[PDB]
């Protein structure tokens, strides 16, 4: 029972983490030791009343990403939705969906991403987003609803993850609040990377046991 989906919050140094059919709010503090759970662990149906009577409320969220403002895309199997998550409030809503992925992001029809996406994080370049399913990754523009490039292996786009357990799959991801950085999660292992849009940039090697560096997740992962 580990991290399944994350998206960066619009509130500085904060992130939402989705585990099983549950979620937590966290001050993941990249520049500090002072890490901490802000809200939860709660059920998605309880925390997000907008999602209470949906498949997400029943099953949780297996992939998500920050777009802009207080908005983020959330997925579960072949369906997905845009919602406003309303940081620290009641006032959270469904904006778009729930649609199938192939109706939200048409270009995905015919590919591995059509029946489900593993994880995803917001790129620093414009309205761009990187997504992961299996051992391939996509580069999209959610605003113009197009694929910026052909879908290639994580090994090809991200050379730093070669020879790491992250080479054949990522369970969860989110972008840091710091420039060109994102976190990746697979099982009990995590890594902080420094990504440059449109490059074969290596670094880093920092594959660490998640509980070792996230003090405030002991008791939550592994969620039994
Ligand atoms: Na996932």
Automatic annotation (TrEMBL):
InterPro entries attached to this UniProt entry: Hemopexin-like_dom_sf, Hemopexin-like_repeat
SMART domains referenced in this protein's UniProt entry, alphabetically: HX
Annotated residues for binding of Ca(2+): 4, 62, 118, 171
Signal peptide limits: none
UniProt entry keywords in alphabetical sequence: Calcium, Metal-binding
GO molecular function: metal ion binding
Hemopexin repeat windows: 114-161, 167-217
Name of the molecule in the record: Lectin
Organism encoding this protein: Cicer arietinum (Chickpea)
């Amino acid at each position: 029972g580990y991290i399944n989906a994350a998206f960066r919050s619009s509130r500085n140094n904060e992130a939402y983490l989705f585990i099983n059919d549950k979620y937590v709010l966290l001050d993941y503090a990249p520049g500090t030791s002072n890490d901490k759970v802000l809200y939860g662990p709660s059920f998605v149906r309880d925390g997000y009343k907008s999602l209470a009577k949906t498949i997400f409320g029943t099953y949780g969220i297996d992939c998500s990403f920050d777009t802009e403002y207080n908005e983020a895309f959330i997925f579960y199997e072949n369906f997905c939705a845009r919602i406003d998550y309303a940081p620290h409030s009641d006032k959270d809503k469904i904006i778009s969906g729930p649609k199938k992925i192939a109706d939200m992001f048409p270009f995905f029809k015919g590919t591995v991403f059509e029946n489900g996406i593993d994880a995803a994080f917001r790129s620093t370049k414009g309205k761009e987003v990187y997504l992961f399913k299996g051992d391939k990754y996509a580069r999209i523009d959610y605003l113009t609803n197009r694929l910026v490039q052909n879908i290639k292996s994580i090994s090809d786009g991200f050379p730093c993850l070669r020879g790491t357990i992250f080479e054949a799959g990522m369970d969860s991801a989110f972008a840091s609040h710091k420039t060109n950085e994102a976190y990746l999660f697979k099982g009990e292992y995590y890594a902080r990377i420094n990504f440059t849009p449109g490059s074969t940039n290596d670094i880093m090697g920092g594959v660490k046991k998640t509980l070792d560096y996230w003090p405030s997740l002991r008791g939550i992962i592994p969620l039994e």
